[PDB]
Amino acid sequence: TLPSTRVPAGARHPIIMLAEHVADTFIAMGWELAEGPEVETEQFNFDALNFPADHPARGEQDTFYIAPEDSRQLLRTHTSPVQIRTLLARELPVYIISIGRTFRTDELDATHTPIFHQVEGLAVDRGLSMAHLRGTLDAFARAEFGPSARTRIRPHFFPFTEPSAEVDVWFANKAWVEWGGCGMVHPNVLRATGIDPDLYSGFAFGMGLERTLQFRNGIPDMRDMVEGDVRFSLPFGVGA
Amino acid sequence: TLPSTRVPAGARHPIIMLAEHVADTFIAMGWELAEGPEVETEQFNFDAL
Amino acid sequence: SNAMRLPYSWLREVVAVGASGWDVTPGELEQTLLRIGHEVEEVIPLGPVDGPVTVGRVARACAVDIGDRQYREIATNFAVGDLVVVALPGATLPGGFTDGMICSAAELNLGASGILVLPPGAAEPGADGAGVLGLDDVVFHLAITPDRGYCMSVRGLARELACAYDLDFVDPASNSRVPPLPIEGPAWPLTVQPETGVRRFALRPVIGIDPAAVSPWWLQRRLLLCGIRATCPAVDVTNYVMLELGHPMHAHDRNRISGTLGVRFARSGETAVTLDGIERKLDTADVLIVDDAATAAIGGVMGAASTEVRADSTDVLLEAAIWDPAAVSRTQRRLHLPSEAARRYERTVDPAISVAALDRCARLLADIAGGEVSPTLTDWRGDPPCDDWSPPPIRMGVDVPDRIAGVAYPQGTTARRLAQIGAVVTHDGDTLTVTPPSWRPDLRQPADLVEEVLRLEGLEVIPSVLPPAPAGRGLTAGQQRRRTIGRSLALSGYVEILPTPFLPAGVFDLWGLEADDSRRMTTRVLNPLEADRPQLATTLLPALLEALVRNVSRGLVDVALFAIAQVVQPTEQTRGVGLIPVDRRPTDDEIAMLDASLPRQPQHVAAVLAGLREPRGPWGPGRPVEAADAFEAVRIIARASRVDVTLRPAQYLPWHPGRCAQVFVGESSVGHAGQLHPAVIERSGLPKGTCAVELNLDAIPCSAPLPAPRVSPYPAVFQDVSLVVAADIPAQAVADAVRAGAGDLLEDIALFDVFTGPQIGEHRKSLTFALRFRAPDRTLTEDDASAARDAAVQSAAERVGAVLRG
Amino acid sequence: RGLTAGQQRRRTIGRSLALSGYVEILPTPFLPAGVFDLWGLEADDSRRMTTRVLNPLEADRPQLATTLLPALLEALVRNVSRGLVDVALFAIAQVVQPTEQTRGVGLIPVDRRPTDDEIAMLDASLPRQPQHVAAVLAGLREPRGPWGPGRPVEAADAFEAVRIIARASRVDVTLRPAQYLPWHPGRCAQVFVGESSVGHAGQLHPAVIERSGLPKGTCAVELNLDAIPCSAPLPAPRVSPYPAVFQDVSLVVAADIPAQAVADAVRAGAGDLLEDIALFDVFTGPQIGEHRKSLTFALRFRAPDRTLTEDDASAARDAAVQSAAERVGAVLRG
RNA sequence: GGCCAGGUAGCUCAGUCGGUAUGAGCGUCCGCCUGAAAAGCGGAAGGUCGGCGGUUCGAUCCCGCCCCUGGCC
Ligand SMILES: O=C1NC(=O)[C@@]2(CCN(Cc3ccccc3)C2)N1
Ligand SMILES: [Mg+2]
Ligand code: NA
Ligand code: NA
């Protein structure tokens, strides 16, 4: 029974492992992964996503802009411009997932972080409907919250989706918890990428990884997810 | 440039790696992976086929 | 702000006009609003109180008539004669607050300084306080999305409820509900510049109101429940109609207007004193209302004090205007004025109810203030005058909402729902022509119409149908490599962190880098959370070293961290590109222009080590971290990448110059590794002996080797060779020279001795390699292995100057 | 749905062993001739109850493998006999462990679907075939180099192979002394997951090594992966911002007391304040006494909501000392 | 935008309106002690008291600005 581990194993980050598990779930359903730059142009982060000219999210209040002023260059407020680059470079149909670092103006406390990771999905094909979106969200929920996981969509609003909806998740390991948003791809976004809206429909969705990992595992302080303390990562095991 | 690898790395068998690559290829297309016993009844090995 | 507050009683009242006897549980109404697309923030009731809570009249203690001649006695707000509400001795105000006590709007849980003063005639002194104040009501706090500006009132939300409950709706802005006041001539001269974005401007005066009159209790109470404090009947009706119909109204002093009113752009440096008594610096892109003297109001934001309705105004000129949403939103955000009117104008206001809402104020003002409505009206509706405010019609298939939803709705569902929200729907075979109402400018495309049918039918009917899995290719080579690198480092003792892209303040000054260092050329953020950290990360080490200090400063002194993330390396000044039109696809030249304007963002892998590399135990005292541990992390990443790397000495801060290796893949530099400089460690507060690694994964090419080894069945020959080289000769260079000379018989070579001493000479060293020779087709003799050994010795003497140990 | 949890774990176990120095082989299901007689197994040993092939390629190898060790040891002999003396091999495959004599099932008519009872009958007639992971080690575990002459393979290396498979499976295992051939009875551990036995590990018996032509000091490990439940833990760590307290406790126990039993007693007595415990000294000097050993553990105490005093940590240390005195008979060194 | 209240050792926090923070607990170091440790006892190291300036022979403590936090808006 003497200790024999001369080199104590480390640990991959739980967010990275959750991202890898989310990726494998969609790879198993025929999707693929795509990456994009974190410093993104305003053309792909707002303009191509049907954001109006005077949208409040385009100001210096919520979006990290790159100096000097009016440079049209910023840290991405979402991984959606990665899907725009895929819609411009790849041939239809497109079933891709984007898991990357996201930047928001919210301060770092026990339940919010300015630097978080989110997963965004994008499916564009002939005859995609809301039922295909809800079925994808449910398969996403079951793989991350157990077989008894079910999603619920309530009408909402997003500039790049129409109709839009927010996703709530039900997991029997705690009720409904606010998970993320979804909706059918707006026809303006398809026209901004050279796609005929009359021939191709599509849906999209987006959830935060730090948010998903918080209420699932019951992690109280989300500052422990990003500060890089060894006591937080080691209990999650070495990794895959 | 001195040697520093005090733990000589091993290797997974190439056949196992090829089977893993083949599995990932079909899983990426929606397929799944099933297993079975090597000692099988003649009903499932011949008669059912 | 996207906040909308109104009580349930007022909302139920407008709905009950068309659907008599309609009344639902506030819990049910919240589920209905949340189901059709309205986010409910909070459902707060009023009060509640019980027992001794009645209304009294004052006659600074004074006798308060609690009713039936039972006077009891008990701050600058009320005087003598004002009806007030008191919690008689033995109070039970929310929550548990137990002479008398003259309550306020905040103490009773009803509104926001002074005490509550009921208007004269609101209630006989002695009535039930909970009944007069209406504490049984429930206030709904809603967060209205920007696409539904028509829901910024009771009119829009009552319409939404009538749609969800399939009710008959009576528009409170209709001419059958608002009798059209006579039009016997102009109300006031008006000039307007058509390039300012005004769509409609209506004016109607009210003459001879009572200055001492106050608004009735039902009007003031509904204002407080919506978050607006009552002032005077002239202003209370302007805010009450705004909350009712959605068209914001502003009252001016008719006698305090000199000359012709004029809607006009502002001037640079022009400052207008608003109603709050604050100077507001204006811009050339702002809309104003001016006359022959000063400025009357800021277009769609807030009125000025020049025409402000005082507490003595008798002649009031009411204003009903429709301003440009972009001009109002651009103006109210510059000077920080999120007024109730500006929030609704930026979300568009129904331009067809301007006169209807105008006549709503005049009749309501003259009724509660004893005024006389003048039969004059000035209604400017553009040039030429616009008499139809309907948006362009939309065409879409009758089954388009069925296809987008994946549900076979009953026939007539799309046409019924679209007419239910106020749109004109005509049939032409299988194509519907839908003209949205004037209060729905968000409906422009068929997708907008699909949302209306889907949200009203409920998104719960949409089934869960997994789409067919396409023939995907899976993870790319680089994505598989990042996983393998993470697995291999974690299994070797490294703990992954999430690095932050914001560099510490003066991190490169602590590293002692030169002024022209490429890593100093960073990308600055205009609005960072910390003003002293605006620069983006050109290297993952500062984020790792920061996390290394955090673990060491908290009792974890034996740390090994790593991170896999991109960096931001600009090649020029921050340069943006012009706006590409969104109505088309950007060409490949414009896409490459967008990529070139962005800084280079390659994905790096980096790692830091400190303290004990191997922990102590029953085997020994452990081993501290040294530079070779950093070099081994390079080999671990290399084996995970299935590429061969070479290490060469290099001087590269912040690494120690004599303990730094530059990693190469073939002939391309991919990063550095080793121990950090002791000065950098001292200035940064790092623990002594800290080692670091950083590689550029984009510079490492993806490899797919296909080995075909042939296992020889013949015995091997074991030999050792000792070679003396100069001290600066890398042991790998000797091994490569021995391998190149030994030939194909050399199956394996391993270094197992590095000896220095006087037997060898100054600045020289002896290296002993273990050699294993094996033939693929025969058994070797000792001379055959010695011949390949002698060739390896000669190859070492010619490449690194090795001398055979004697 | 992608890979199952078992398929995913089999990859992780293979990656971890390969990255730890082990070389994967493909084990042959046919057992060597008289290998159990070389191991000295009893006549009623369950591993002897094998399934035999009627027409094998080699008539002296008809039986199917009840354990993966014979194929690994045969591959171990091949490597060593050809100049590769420092080798660590592993394999992940199934075994054939019958529970009765070879009993067949009659022909089911293929013109229809077999009923669920007939499918269950066909499965019951087949021998049990669980997934096994096993490894063998010989020669130098750590090679020689500029650091030193290397370290030969010892039983602890086989014990560490267990913890590598355990960490890769995200399960907690315990090792207990056991007498189970072909292992050395004094250097053999039985691996448990909770209270279920999953295999053994350690150094092979010296007599088995002589009779089998194996290298001296050969170590081996074999675990039943089916007996290890697939776990999906959801940790929720609470990183305390308050400083820790470092203390060391030296306890004297009998030589037969396992070091993990002392550590388990110290944790049980220390309470929630104990953040970490690690053994770093095993002293058997003459001032300790015959058949007695001293164990020194490094303790790290940390409170989640306050800063501890030295007395607070000492109170937890003393409670840990009493727990060791009660469960393993430890005596405080002095 | 308002007065305030806070930033102090490696960690968590006390305390002074001007010359010593005789700072605490834990963390670090030395000695006695032990085969080596820890505890215990006995000694120590370590802060430029939020930054840039202003007054003063002298500023953690007073003026001004700002950096970042809560509070209450
Ligand atoms: O706060 C937030 N974090 C997020 O990820 C989001 C949730 C999802 N939203 C993105 C999205 C909206 C509609 C369709 C596809 C993606 C952003 N909101
Ligand atoms: Mg819409
Ligand atoms: Na070295
Ligand atoms: Na030389």
Numbering used by the authors:
A (entry chain D): 98 to 271, 276 to 341
B (entry chain A): 98 to 146
C (entry chain E): -2 to 56, 69 to 83, 87 to 110, 122 to 135, 138 to 831
D (entry chain B): 498 to 831
Publication excerpt:
AaRSs catalyze the attachment of the correct amino acid to its cognate tRNA which then is used in protein synthesis on ribosomes. Phylogenetically phenylalanyl-tRNA synthetase (PheRS), belongs to the class II aaRSs, and it is a dimer of heterodimers (αβ)2, containing two α- (PheS) and two β- (PheT) subunits. Structural studies of PheRS have shown that the α subunit binds L-Phe and ATP and is responsible for esterification catalysis. At the same time, the β subunit is involved in the recognition of the cognate tRNA molecule and editing of mis-charged tRNA.
The protein-fragment interactions were analyzed using crystal structures for five of those fragments complexed with MtPheRS/tRNAPhe (DDD00107555 (D-555), DDD01008876 (D-876), DDD00805735 (D-735), DDD00079004 (D-004) and DDD00067116 (D-116)). All five fragments occupy the L-Phe site in the α subunit of the heterotetramer. The fragments’ orientation in these structures is very similar to the L-Phe substrate, however there are subtle differences in orientation and details of interactions. PIEDA showed that the phenyl ring or the bicyclic core of the fragments interact with residues αPhe255 and αPhe257 through hydrophobic interaction. A strong Π-cation interaction between the imidazolidinedione core of D-876 and αArg201 is observed. The carbonyl oxygen of the imidazolidinedione core interacts with αGln215 of MtPheRS through hydrogen bond. The top-ranking fragment D-876 maintains all the critical interactions and makes additional interactions with residues αArg201, αGln215, αGly309 and αArg312. In accordance with this, binding of D-876 fragment exhibited highest interaction energy (−93.6 kcal/mol) and ligand efficiency score (5.2). However, the auxiliary pocket in the structures of PheRS with bound fragments was completely unoccupied offering an opportunity for fragment growth by adding hydrophobic substituents to explore the auxiliary pocket of MtPheRS.
